Every structure is written in structure tokens, then in C-alpha cells.
Amino acid sequence: MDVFLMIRRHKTTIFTDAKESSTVFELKRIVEGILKRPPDEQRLYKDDQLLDDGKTLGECGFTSQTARPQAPATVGLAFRADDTFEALCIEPFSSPPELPDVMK
Amino acid sequence: SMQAARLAKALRELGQTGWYWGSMTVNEAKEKLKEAPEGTFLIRDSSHSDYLLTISVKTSAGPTNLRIEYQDGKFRLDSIICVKSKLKQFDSVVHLIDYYVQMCKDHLYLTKPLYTSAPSLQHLCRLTINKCTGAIWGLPLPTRLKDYLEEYKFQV
Amino acid sequence: MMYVKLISSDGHEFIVKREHALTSGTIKAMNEVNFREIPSHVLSKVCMYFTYKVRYTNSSTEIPEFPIAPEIALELLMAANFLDC
Ligand SMILES: *CC(=O)Nc1cccc(CNC(=O)[C@H](Cc2ccc(OP(=O)(O)O)cc2)NC(=O)Cc2ccc(F)cc2)c1
């Protein structure tokens, strides 16, 4: 069961995929190879819920039907800051302009 | 005249749909549509030399098929079946399909096409824009992109 | 040669599989790319298109709908044309 994800921190968005049977830790290993911070310096979130390293992505609620290629599920990411973690902070994408009236 | 220049334009449009399956047989279309939602449809070549194309569509009772004829520069649903005088004629076969899809939204029931492959992102945007308006002329787009939209004005 | 970084006009960084980014002939012609005229509400959708296109090319899986909000469709059309995808 493939799950398609956006891992998001600040203004960084990683598009990647994994399996429902993948662990949260394995996701942190993907992030480590991209952003060069080790798993112990990462916190991953589904909405505001901290994810435990040992759980599978399916156990966290990431399912193939709700994490599709054309509509990936978001995983929040926060990094170590000194002796603690930064607060989770994901910056929104830009706002679309107003539709032409002909299109509304 | 068979108006081959018009036919070529219509077949180009058909090639852009992403839901034209070419040489597919009736049996192959049945297997493809067997478990699809009601109204799921595709277009393919017809086995019958008097017709150009066939619509294959899922009904509540299973897939069914309806041929399309091309005569004198016009496409029309099969008139051996449907009463001829009440059949609209079209210059474009994608227009024919789009017309019946839109009529079903407001006994051929068409909803959504079965794609052979993923369309280009440009085409997906074109579909979205067409579902919003037909007034290409006034969109805030460069002329190049208005011409692109004009090449395929259909909502399906 | 595993991921590439695509940066939107408003400074969002999208890190995507290089194989998937090559869906774009324009990206394929050119590790990081800056799109001075494509904002993040457009570029994020482009990146989902890459995932969808790779997944649903030469598959036996039924091809699902690719969702595009009317409000992004015009800029996304221009992006897709510029990107040749
Ligand atoms: C005006 C209107 O709405 N007419 C209309 C709509 C829906 C259905 C029909 C009647 N259709 C049939 O009787 C078809 C005839 C048919 C059979 C096979 C093809 O494919 P081709 O030879 O490759 O062009 C075209 C038309 N009968 C069926 O579809 C029955 C059927 C179903 C599944 C199969 F695998 C085989 C046959 C009129």
C-alpha cells in the first residue's frame, strides 16, 4: 500500500512516498538523506499530533486512499533547536488571485 | 463529400481526449467497464464498416454499446437504433460526446470517461477552464494559450 | 541524482524526485531551479502532477481524476505550458 506525502517545514516541502507498513523512523531516514539532519533531531506530525518513531504510517492514519499521488497527505516536520525542538511551523502556500467574473 | 478535412480535425480532437481506445473490441470494452460506476464511458473503433466509432458505457445492467456514424461531414448517433429525425448532428465527435454528457447532468447516460493514460497538465487545465467558461476570448491569457484552448473547447 | 529542488517565486522550496521532475521537458532540458514567475500555490500542484503522471503512465490501474481548483487553473495552464508537461 503506497502512501504519497508532503513533508513540510517552514517553506520546505518534500514530495516523497512510502508504504502504510513504513515506520515513522523510516520516514525520518528519508528526511535525513535529503535535509542532512539525523532522525533524533526530527519530530514528525500528523496535524498537531506527534508521531512515535515505532508506529507505522498506517498506524498513524496515513492510508493509500487518503495519501494519493494527486492529493498527498501532509506530514509536519520540526527540527532540533539547541537543547529542544523548534515549534512546528508550516508556512502556507501563496493565495490565488480572484477569479475572473466569467469563471465564477 | 466525406469532408476529409473536417474528419481529420475531428480525429485530432479525439486523439486529445485521452479516452479514445482505438482498435478495442466490444469484449475488451466490456471487461474494462464491467465494474465501473454507472455512466462511465469510452470511445473506440467500431467493428462495423458502416460506422466510424462506438461508445461503450456502463449501465446498471452491464456495459452497453452505441455506434456513431459519420456521413456528409456530420457525426450522429446510430439511426438504425434511435429515431433519425430527433438525432442532433455534429461537426465534431468530441462535441457529440460533450453534448450528451452535459445533457445528462441537467436512453444514453454518460458521466465520466475512462482514460487510457494520464493527460498532460496543460490539457487538464484546459478541461478545468472549459468547465468554468466558454469565453476564451476574454481570459487574461496570452494569445498563444487562447489558441490552445480553442483547439479543444470541450468539458470532457 | 535522487532529488531536485524547485523554488517558487515566493520562495517555497519543493524537493522532488529527479525522475519525477523530468516529467517536465523544460526541467529536463536544464540541483536547484528557481521559477521567478510561478508562485507556490501553482508550483505545489505541478509537483503533485509529476507524482500522478509517473504513477499513472503505463499502468493497469484505472486513472483517477486530477483535481484542479478553478482559482489556480489559469496560472497552472501557463506554468504547464512553460514547463512542457
Ligand atoms: C439512441 C440510443 O440512446 N440508443 C442506444 C443507447 C444504448 C444502447 C443501445 C442499443 N445497443 C445495442 O443493441 C448494442 C449493439 C452493439 C454491439 C456491439 C457494438 O460494438 P462494435 O460492433 O465494435 O461497434 C456496437 C453496438 N448491444 C450491446 O451493446 C450488447 C452487448 C453488450 C456487451 C457486449 F460485450 C456485447 C454486446 C442503443
mmCIF file of all heavy atoms in Angstrom, chain B residues 81-125, unseen atoms left out:
data_model
loop_
_atom_site.group_PDB
_atom_site.id
_atom_site.type_symbol
_atom_site.label_atom_id
_atom_site.label_comp_id
_atom_site.label_asym_id
_atom_site.label_seq_id
_atom_site.Cartn_x
_atom_site.Cartn_y
_atom_site.Cartn_z
ATOM 1 N N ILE B 81 -31.026 2.513 -34.691
ATOM 2 C CA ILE B 81 -31.478 2.322 -33.324
ATOM 3 C C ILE B 81 -32.394 3.482 -32.963
ATOM 4 O O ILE B 81 -33.613 3.315 -32.821
ATOM 5 C CB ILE B 81 -30.267 2.245 -32.373
ATOM 6 C CG1 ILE B 81 -29.465 0.965 -32.641
ATOM 7 C CG2 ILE B 81 -30.719 2.335 -30.929
ATOM 8 C CD1 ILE B 81 -28.678 0.444 -31.461
ATOM 9 N N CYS B 82 -31.810 4.671 -32.848
ATOM 10 C CA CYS B 82 -32.533 5.858 -32.414
ATOM 11 C C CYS B 82 -33.280 6.494 -33.586
ATOM 12 O O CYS B 82 -32.850 6.408 -34.737
ATOM 13 C CB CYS B 82 -31.550 6.852 -31.792
ATOM 14 S SG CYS B 82 -30.076 6.077 -30.974
ATOM 15 N N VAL B 83 -34.417 7.132 -33.286
ATOM 16 C CA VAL B 83 -35.218 7.784 -34.327
ATOM 17 C C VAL B 83 -34.399 8.888 -34.994
ATOM 18 O O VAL B 83 -33.991 9.857 -34.343
ATOM 19 C CB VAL B 83 -36.524 8.333 -33.741
ATOM 20 N N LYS B 84 -34.201 8.759 -36.312
ATOM 21 C CA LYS B 84 -33.231 9.577 -37.046
ATOM 22 C C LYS B 84 -33.502 11.067 -36.884
ATOM 23 O O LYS B 84 -32.592 11.842 -36.570
ATOM 24 C CB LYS B 84 -33.261 9.204 -38.532
ATOM 25 C CG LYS B 84 -31.990 9.519 -39.325
ATOM 26 C CD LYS B 84 -31.954 8.668 -40.601
ATOM 27 C CE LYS B 84 -30.703 8.922 -41.435
ATOM 28 N NZ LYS B 84 -30.971 9.698 -42.683
ATOM 29 N N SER B 85 -34.752 11.487 -37.117
ATOM 30 C CA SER B 85 -35.088 12.908 -37.175
ATOM 31 C C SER B 85 -34.801 13.638 -35.868
ATOM 32 O O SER B 85 -34.571 14.851 -35.891
ATOM 33 C CB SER B 85 -36.566 13.079 -37.565
ATOM 34 N N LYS B 86 -34.796 12.934 -34.735
ATOM 35 C CA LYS B 86 -34.559 13.545 -33.435
ATOM 36 C C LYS B 86 -33.103 13.459 -32.999
ATOM 37 O O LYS B 86 -32.801 13.712 -31.827
ATOM 38 C CB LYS B 86 -35.465 12.901 -32.381
ATOM 39 N N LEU B 87 -32.193 13.110 -33.905
ATOM 40 C CA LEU B 87 -30.777 12.967 -33.582
ATOM 41 C C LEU B 87 -30.041 14.227 -34.016
ATOM 42 O O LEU B 87 -30.102 14.615 -35.188
ATOM 43 C CB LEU B 87 -30.181 11.743 -34.273
ATOM 44 C CG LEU B 87 -30.617 10.381 -33.739
ATOM 45 C CD1 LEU B 87 -29.924 9.266 -34.498
ATOM 46 C CD2 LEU B 87 -30.306 10.298 -32.250
ATOM 47 N N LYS B 88 -29.358 14.864 -33.075
ATOM 48 C CA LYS B 88 -28.560 16.030 -33.404
ATOM 49 C C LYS B 88 -27.357 15.607 -34.244
ATOM 50 O O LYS B 88 -26.784 14.529 -34.029
ATOM 51 C CB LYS B 88 -28.092 16.717 -32.121
ATOM 52 C CG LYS B 88 -27.469 18.084 -32.347
ATOM 53 C CD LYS B 88 -27.483 18.923 -31.067
ATOM 54 C CE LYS B 88 -26.514 20.106 -31.172
ATOM 55 N NZ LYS B 88 -26.929 21.046 -32.263
ATOM 56 N N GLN B 89 -26.959 16.452 -35.197
ATOM 57 C CA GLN B 89 -25.753 16.188 -35.978
ATOM 58 C C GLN B 89 -24.647 17.144 -35.549
ATOM 59 O O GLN B 89 -24.909 18.323 -35.274
ATOM 60 C CB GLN B 89 -25.993 16.342 -37.479
ATOM 61 C CG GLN B 89 -26.871 15.269 -38.096
ATOM 62 C CD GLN B 89 -27.181 15.563 -39.549
ATOM 63 O OE1 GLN B 89 -27.962 16.452 -39.859
ATOM 64 N NE2 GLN B 89 -26.583 14.790 -40.448
ATOM 65 N N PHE B 90 -23.410 16.643 -35.546
ATOM 66 C CA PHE B 90 -22.257 17.370 -35.036
ATOM 67 C C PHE B 90 -21.124 17.385 -36.054
ATOM 68 O O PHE B 90 -20.897 16.397 -36.761
ATOM 69 C CB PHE B 90 -21.759 16.740 -33.746
ATOM 70 C CG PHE B 90 -22.784 16.719 -32.649
ATOM 71 C CD1 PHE B 90 -23.718 15.701 -32.577
ATOM 72 C CD2 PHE B 90 -22.788 17.707 -31.675
ATOM 73 C CE1 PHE B 90 -24.660 15.674 -31.556
ATOM 74 C CE2 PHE B 90 -23.717 17.681 -30.644
ATOM 75 C CZ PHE B 90 -24.652 16.665 -30.586
ATOM 76 N N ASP B 91 -20.397 18.507 -36.108
ATOM 77 C CA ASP B 91 -19.153 18.549 -36.872
ATOM 78 C C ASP B 91 -18.017 17.827 -36.163
ATOM 79 O O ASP B 91 -17.020 17.467 -36.803
ATOM 80 C CB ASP B 91 -18.706 19.994 -37.112
ATOM 81 C CG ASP B 91 -19.634 20.754 -38.018
ATOM 82 O OD1 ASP B 91 -20.185 20.155 -38.961
ATOM 83 O OD2 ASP B 91 -19.779 21.975 -37.803
ATOM 84 N N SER B 92 -18.139 17.621 -34.862
ATOM 85 C CA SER B 92 -17.063 17.098 -34.036
ATOM 86 C C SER B 92 -17.605 15.940 -33.206
ATOM 87 O O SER B 92 -18.713 16.025 -32.659
ATOM 88 C CB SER B 92 -16.508 18.227 -33.125
ATOM 89 O OG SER B 92 -15.903 17.691 -31.960
ATOM 90 N N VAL B 93 -16.835 14.857 -33.106
ATOM 91 C CA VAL B 93 -17.342 13.742 -32.311
ATOM 92 C C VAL B 93 -17.105 13.981 -30.818
ATOM 93 O O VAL B 93 -17.905 13.532 -29.983
ATOM 94 C CB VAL B 93 -16.757 12.399 -32.787
ATOM 95 C CG1 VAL B 93 -15.286 12.278 -32.463
ATOM 96 C CG2 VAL B 93 -17.558 11.224 -32.171
ATOM 97 N N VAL B 94 -16.040 14.690 -30.436
ATOM 98 C CA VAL B 94 -15.931 15.049 -29.020
ATOM 99 C C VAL B 94 -17.067 15.997 -28.628
ATOM 100 O O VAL B 94 -17.638 15.884 -27.533
ATOM 101 C CB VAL B 94 -14.544 15.635 -28.705
ATOM 102 C CG1 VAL B 94 -14.402 15.851 -27.195
ATOM 103 C CG2 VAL B 94 -13.440 14.659 -29.201
ATOM 104 N N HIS B 95 -17.449 16.909 -29.534
ATOM 105 C CA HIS B 95 -18.626 17.745 -29.281
ATOM 106 C C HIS B 95 -19.866 16.887 -29.067
ATOM 107 O O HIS B 95 -20.654 17.135 -28.145
ATOM 108 C CB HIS B 95 -18.848 18.711 -30.436
ATOM 109 C CG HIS B 95 -19.917 19.727 -30.174
ATOM 110 N ND1 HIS B 95 -20.500 20.464 -31.179
ATOM 111 C CD2 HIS B 95 -20.516 20.120 -29.023
ATOM 112 C CE1 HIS B 95 -21.404 21.280 -30.662
ATOM 113 N NE2 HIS B 95 -21.433 21.091 -29.354
ATOM 114 N N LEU B 96 -20.045 15.860 -29.903
ATOM 115 C CA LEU B 96 -21.182 14.962 -29.742
ATOM 116 C C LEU B 96 -21.203 14.389 -28.332
ATOM 117 O O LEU B 96 -22.228 14.448 -27.640
ATOM 118 C CB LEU B 96 -21.120 13.844 -30.790
ATOM 119 C CG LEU B 96 -22.273 12.828 -30.852
ATOM 120 C CD1 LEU B 96 -22.421 12.237 -32.273
ATOM 121 C CD2 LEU B 96 -22.059 11.694 -29.824
ATOM 122 N N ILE B 97 -20.061 13.860 -27.884
ATOM 123 C CA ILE B 97 -19.992 13.246 -26.558
ATOM 124 C C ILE B 97 -20.257 14.288 -25.476
ATOM 125 O O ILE B 97 -21.057 14.060 -24.558
ATOM 126 C CB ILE B 97 -18.629 12.563 -26.345
ATOM 127 C CG1 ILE B 97 -18.438 11.399 -27.330
ATOM 128 C CG2 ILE B 97 -18.477 12.128 -24.858
ATOM 129 C CD1 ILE B 97 -19.505 10.264 -27.207
ATOM 130 N N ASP B 98 -19.585 15.445 -25.570
ATOM 131 C CA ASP B 98 -19.726 16.501 -24.569
ATOM 132 C C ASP B 98 -21.171 16.966 -24.469
ATOM 133 O O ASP B 98 -21.678 17.230 -23.370
ATOM 134 C CB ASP B 98 -18.824 17.685 -24.911
ATOM 135 C CG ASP B 98 -18.523 18.573 -23.694
ATOM 136 O OD1 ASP B 98 -18.579 18.105 -22.538
ATOM 137 O OD2 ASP B 98 -18.282 19.745 -23.906
ATOM 138 N N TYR B 99 -21.852 17.054 -25.610
ATOM 139 C CA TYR B 99 -23.253 17.454 -25.610
ATOM 140 C C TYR B 99 -24.100 16.486 -24.789
ATOM 141 O O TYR B 99 -24.901 16.910 -23.947
ATOM 142 C CB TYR B 99 -23.756 17.531 -27.046
ATOM 143 C CG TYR B 99 -25.237 17.810 -27.155
ATOM 144 C CD1 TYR B 99 -25.717 19.108 -27.155
ATOM 145 C CD2 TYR B 99 -26.148 16.770 -27.253
ATOM 146 C CE1 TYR B 99 -27.073 19.370 -27.265
ATOM 147 C CE2 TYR B 99 -27.507 17.022 -27.358
ATOM 148 C CZ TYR B 99 -27.954 18.319 -27.359
ATOM 149 O OH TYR B 99 -29.288 18.555 -27.476
ATOM 150 N N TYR B 100 -23.943 15.180 -25.027
ATOM 151 C CA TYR B 100 -24.745 14.214 -24.279
ATOM 152 C C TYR B 100 -24.310 14.128 -22.814
ATOM 153 O O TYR B 100 -25.160 13.943 -21.938
ATOM 154 C CB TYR B 100 -24.723 12.843 -24.978
ATOM 155 C CG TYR B 100 -25.486 12.897 -26.300
ATOM 156 C CD1 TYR B 100 -24.836 12.694 -27.509
ATOM 157 C CD2 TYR B 100 -26.837 13.185 -26.333
ATOM 158 C CE1 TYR B 100 -25.515 12.771 -28.708
ATOM 159 C CE2 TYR B 100 -27.526 13.277 -27.545
ATOM 160 C CZ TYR B 100 -26.845 13.070 -28.729
ATOM 161 O OH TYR B 100 -27.504 13.136 -29.948
ATOM 162 N N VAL B 101 -23.021 14.315 -22.513
ATOM 163 C CA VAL B 101 -22.601 14.340 -21.111
ATOM 164 C C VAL B 101 -23.286 15.490 -20.377
ATOM 165 O O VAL B 101 -23.810 15.328 -19.263
ATOM 166 C CB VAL B 101 -21.068 14.447 -21.001
ATOM 167 C CG1 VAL B 101 -20.657 14.850 -19.562
ATOM 168 C CG2 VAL B 101 -20.401 13.127 -21.436
ATOM 169 N N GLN B 102 -23.283 16.673 -20.990
ATOM 170 C CA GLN B 102 -23.889 17.836 -20.358
ATOM 171 C C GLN B 102 -25.398 17.674 -20.250
ATOM 172 O O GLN B 102 -25.995 18.095 -19.255
ATOM 173 C CB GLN B 102 -23.531 19.103 -21.138
ATOM 174 C CG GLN B 102 -22.042 19.522 -21.140
ATOM 175 C CD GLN B 102 -21.242 19.015 -19.944
ATOM 176 O OE1 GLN B 102 -21.603 19.295 -18.791
ATOM 177 N NE2 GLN B 102 -20.143 18.293 -20.204
ATOM 178 N N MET B 103 -26.037 17.075 -21.262
ATOM 179 C CA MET B 103 -27.482 16.841 -21.156
ATOM 180 C C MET B 103 -27.809 15.933 -19.977
ATOM 181 O O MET B 103 -28.807 16.146 -19.277
ATOM 182 C CB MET B 103 -28.026 16.239 -22.449
ATOM 183 C CG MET B 103 -27.914 17.153 -23.657
ATOM 184 S SD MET B 103 -29.020 18.583 -23.552
ATOM 185 C CE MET B 103 -30.560 17.780 -23.107
ATOM 186 N N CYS B 104 -26.982 14.911 -19.743
ATOM 187 C CA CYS B 104 -27.224 14.003 -18.626
ATOM 188 C C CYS B 104 -27.047 14.681 -17.274
ATOM 189 O O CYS B 104 -27.616 14.208 -16.283
ATOM 190 C CB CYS B 104 -26.299 12.786 -18.724
ATOM 191 S SG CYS B 104 -26.751 11.669 -20.071
ATOM 192 N N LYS B 105 -26.288 15.778 -17.206
ATOM 193 C CA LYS B 105 -26.097 16.469 -15.932
ATOM 194 C C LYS B 105 -27.321 17.297 -15.565
ATOM 195 O O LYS B 105 -27.702 17.366 -14.390
ATOM 196 C CB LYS B 105 -24.842 17.348 -15.996
ATOM 197 C CG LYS B 105 -23.569 16.520 -16.141
ATOM 198 C CD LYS B 105 -22.350 17.069 -15.408
ATOM 199 C CE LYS B 105 -21.874 18.383 -15.973
ATOM 200 N NZ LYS B 105 -20.384 18.414 -16.042
ATOM 201 N N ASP B 106 -27.953 17.919 -16.556
ATOM 202 C CA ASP B 106 -29.163 18.699 -16.338
ATOM 203 C C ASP B 106 -30.392 17.795 -16.299
ATOM 204 O O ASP B 106 -30.903 17.380 -17.337
ATOM 205 C CB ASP B 106 -29.315 19.759 -17.430
ATOM 206 N N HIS B 107 -32.056 6.948 -24.395
ATOM 207 C CA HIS B 107 -31.622 6.467 -23.085
ATOM 208 C C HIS B 107 -30.125 6.156 -23.064
ATOM 209 O O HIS B 107 -29.697 5.026 -22.823
ATOM 210 C CB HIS B 107 -32.433 5.235 -22.666
ATOM 211 C CG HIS B 107 -32.270 4.059 -23.579
ATOM 212 N ND1 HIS B 107 -31.392 3.029 -23.315
ATOM 213 C CD2 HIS B 107 -32.885 3.741 -24.743
ATOM 214 C CE1 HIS B 107 -31.465 2.134 -24.284
ATOM 215 N NE2 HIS B 107 -32.364 2.541 -25.162
ATOM 216 N N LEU B 108 -29.329 7.183 -23.317
ATOM 217 C CA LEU B 108 -27.882 7.113 -23.203
ATOM 218 C C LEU B 108 -27.475 7.965 -22.011
ATOM 219 O O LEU B 108 -27.711 9.175 -22.005
ATOM 220 C CB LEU B 108 -27.220 7.601 -24.491
ATOM 221 C CG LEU B 108 -25.716 7.835 -24.525
ATOM 222 C CD1 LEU B 108 -24.966 6.508 -24.543
ATOM 223 C CD2 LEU B 108 -25.379 8.681 -25.765
ATOM 224 N N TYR B 109 -26.877 7.339 -21.003
ATOM 225 C CA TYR B 109 -26.488 8.033 -19.781
ATOM 226 C C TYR B 109 -24.970 8.017 -19.662
ATOM 227 O O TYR B 109 -24.369 6.965 -19.414
ATOM 228 C CB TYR B 109 -27.150 7.384 -18.564
ATOM 229 C CG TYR B 109 -26.773 8.054 -17.269
ATOM 230 C CD1 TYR B 109 -27.196 9.351 -16.987
ATOM 231 C CD2 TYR B 109 -25.983 7.401 -16.330
ATOM 232 C CE1 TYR B 109 -26.840 9.977 -15.794
ATOM 233 C CE2 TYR B 109 -25.634 8.019 -15.136
ATOM 234 C CZ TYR B 109 -26.064 9.302 -14.878
ATOM 235 O OH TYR B 109 -25.703 9.922 -13.704
ATOM 236 N N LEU B 110 -24.349 9.184 -19.830
ATOM 237 C CA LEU B 110 -22.900 9.323 -19.808
ATOM 238 C C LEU B 110 -22.509 10.215 -18.644
ATOM 239 O O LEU B 110 -23.101 11.282 -18.456
ATOM 240 C CB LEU B 110 -22.379 9.935 -21.126
ATOM 241 C CG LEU B 110 -22.762 9.219 -22.417
ATOM 242 C CD1 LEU B 110 -22.257 10.026 -23.641
ATOM 243 C CD2 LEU B 110 -22.154 7.812 -22.415
ATOM 244 N N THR B 111 -21.501 9.799 -17.877
ATOM 245 C CA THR B 111 -20.964 10.650 -16.816
ATOM 246 C C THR B 111 -19.494 10.955 -17.070
ATOM 247 O O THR B 111 -19.168 12.062 -17.499
ATOM 248 C CB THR B 111 -21.152 10.007 -15.440
ATOM 249 O OG1 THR B 111 -20.583 8.692 -15.461
ATOM 250 C CG2 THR B 111 -22.636 9.923 -15.072
ATOM 251 N N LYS B 112 -18.595 10.007 -16.816
ATOM 252 C CA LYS B 112 -17.167 10.272 -16.800
ATOM 253 C C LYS B 112 -16.426 9.299 -17.709
ATOM 254 O O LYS B 112 -16.781 8.112 -17.789
ATOM 255 C CB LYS B 112 -16.606 10.168 -15.374
ATOM 256 C CG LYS B 112 -16.940 11.398 -14.524
ATOM 257 C CD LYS B 112 -16.426 11.240 -13.107
ATOM 258 C CE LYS B 112 -16.971 12.350 -12.197
ATOM 259 N NZ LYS B 112 -16.808 13.685 -12.843
ATOM 260 N N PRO B 113 -15.396 9.769 -18.406
ATOM 261 C CA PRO B 113 -14.678 8.890 -19.330
ATOM 262 C C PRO B 113 -13.643 8.037 -18.616
ATOM 263 O O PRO B 113 -13.118 8.390 -17.553
ATOM 264 C CB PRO B 113 -14.005 9.864 -20.309
ATOM 265 C CG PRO B 113 -13.780 11.118 -19.477
ATOM 266 C CD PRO B 113 -14.889 11.158 -18.424
ATOM 267 N N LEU B 114 -13.362 6.899 -19.230
ATOM 268 C CA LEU B 114 -12.304 6.000 -18.785
ATOM 269 C C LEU B 114 -11.054 6.341 -19.580
ATOM 270 O O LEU B 114 -10.999 6.082 -20.781
ATOM 271 C CB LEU B 114 -12.704 4.546 -19.010
ATOM 272 C CG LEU B 114 -11.850 3.539 -18.256
ATOM 273 C CD1 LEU B 114 -12.197 3.654 -16.761
ATOM 274 C CD2 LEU B 114 -12.126 2.123 -18.775
ATOM 275 N N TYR B 115 -10.055 6.917 -18.914
ATOM 276 C CA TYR B 115 -8.821 7.327 -19.580
ATOM 277 C C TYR B 115 -7.899 6.143 -19.879
ATOM 278 O O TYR B 115 -7.749 5.228 -19.057
ATOM 279 C CB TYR B 115 -8.080 8.342 -18.703
ATOM 280 C CG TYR B 115 -8.696 9.729 -18.785
ATOM 281 C CD1 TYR B 115 -9.717 10.113 -17.925
ATOM 282 C CD2 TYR B 115 -8.280 10.636 -19.761
ATOM 283 C CE1 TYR B 115 -10.283 11.384 -18.024
ATOM 284 C CE2 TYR B 115 -8.845 11.890 -19.872
ATOM 285 C CZ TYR B 115 -9.841 12.259 -19.013
ATOM 286 O OH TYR B 115 -10.406 13.521 -19.130
ATOM 287 N N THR B 116 -7.275 6.175 -21.065
ATOM 288 C CA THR B 116 -6.208 5.238 -21.445
ATOM 289 C C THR B 116 -4.875 5.584 -20.807
ATOM 290 O O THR B 116 -4.065 4.690 -20.538
ATOM 291 C CB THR B 116 -5.951 5.240 -22.965
ATOM 292 O OG1 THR B 116 -5.464 6.542 -23.365
ATOM 293 C CG2 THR B 116 -7.163 4.896 -23.763
ATOM 294 N N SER B 117 -4.587 6.873 -20.654
ATOM 295 C CA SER B 117 -3.368 7.320 -19.997
ATOM 296 C C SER B 117 -3.633 8.678 -19.365
ATOM 297 O O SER B 117 -4.666 9.306 -19.600
ATOM 298 C CB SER B 117 -2.174 7.402 -20.953
ATOM 299 O OG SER B 117 -0.961 7.229 -20.228
ATOM 300 N N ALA B 118 -2.702 9.095 -18.532
ATOM 301 C CA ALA B 118 -2.787 10.386 -17.865
ATOM 302 C C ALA B 118 -2.580 11.502 -18.881
ATOM 303 O O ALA B 118 -1.557 11.514 -19.578
ATOM 304 C CB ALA B 118 -1.734 10.469 -16.761
ATOM 305 N N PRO B 119 -3.508 12.442 -19.009
ATOM 306 C CA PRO B 119 -3.300 13.561 -19.935
ATOM 307 C C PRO B 119 -2.195 14.496 -19.455
ATOM 308 O O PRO B 119 -1.766 14.452 -18.304
ATOM 309 C CB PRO B 119 -4.657 14.277 -19.949
ATOM 310 C CG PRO B 119 -5.634 13.278 -19.396
ATOM 311 C CD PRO B 119 -4.849 12.451 -18.408
ATOM 312 N N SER B 120 -1.742 15.355 -20.369
ATOM 313 C CA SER B 120 -0.808 16.412 -19.999
ATOM 314 C C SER B 120 -1.454 17.364 -19.003
ATOM 315 O O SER B 120 -2.678 17.492 -18.935
ATOM 316 C CB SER B 120 -0.367 17.195 -21.235
ATOM 317 O OG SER B 120 -1.437 18.006 -21.694
ATOM 318 N N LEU B 121 -0.614 18.027 -18.208
ATOM 319 C CA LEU B 121 -1.145 19.011 -17.271
ATOM 320 C C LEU B 121 -1.803 20.164 -18.018
ATOM 321 O O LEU B 121 -2.818 20.702 -17.564
ATOM 322 C CB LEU B 121 -0.041 19.531 -16.348
ATOM 323 C CG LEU B 121 -0.470 20.558 -15.281
ATOM 324 C CD1 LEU B 121 -1.648 20.020 -14.390
ATOM 325 C CD2 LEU B 121 0.722 20.938 -14.413
ATOM 326 N N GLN B 122 -1.246 20.556 -19.173
ATOM 327 C CA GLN B 122 -1.901 21.608 -19.952
ATOM 328 C C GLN B 122 -3.322 21.213 -20.325
ATOM 329 O O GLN B 122 -4.239 22.042 -20.267
ATOM 330 C CB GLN B 122 -1.108 21.943 -21.216
ATOM 331 C CG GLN B 122 0.304 22.375 -20.946
ATOM 332 C CD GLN B 122 1.159 22.386 -22.196
ATOM 333 O OE1 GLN B 122 0.909 23.165 -23.112
ATOM 334 N NE2 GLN B 122 2.137 21.486 -22.265
ATOM 335 N N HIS B 123 -3.531 19.948 -20.705
ATOM 336 C CA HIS B 123 -4.870 19.526 -21.095
ATOM 337 C C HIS B 123 -5.811 19.483 -19.900
ATOM 338 O O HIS B 123 -6.998 19.832 -20.018
ATOM 339 C CB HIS B 123 -4.818 18.154 -21.768
ATOM 340 C CG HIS B 123 -6.165 17.659 -22.198
ATOM 341 N ND1 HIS B 123 -6.841 18.190 -23.275
ATOM 342 C CD2 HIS B 123 -6.977 16.709 -21.673
ATOM 343 C CE1 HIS B 123 -8.008 17.579 -23.408
ATOM 344 N NE2 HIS B 123 -8.108 16.664 -22.459
ATOM 345 N N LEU B 124 -5.311 19.027 -18.750
ATOM 346 C CA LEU B 124 -6.138 19.020 -17.549
ATOM 347 C C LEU B 124 -6.575 20.433 -17.177
ATOM 348 O O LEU B 124 -7.732 20.644 -16.786
ATOM 349 C CB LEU B 124 -5.382 18.374 -16.389
ATOM 350 C CG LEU B 124 -4.977 16.912 -16.630
ATOM 351 C CD1 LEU B 124 -4.196 16.376 -15.417
ATOM 352 C CD2 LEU B 124 -6.240 16.096 -16.877
ATOM 353 N N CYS B 125 -5.659 21.416 -17.277
ATOM 354 C CA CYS B 125 -6.071 22.813 -17.067
ATOM 355 C C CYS B 125 -7.092 23.271 -18.086
ATOM 356 O O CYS B 125 -8.063 23.955 -17.733
ATOM 357 C CB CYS B 125 -4.879 23.778 -17.058
ATOM 358 S SG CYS B 125 -3.614 23.413 -15.844
#
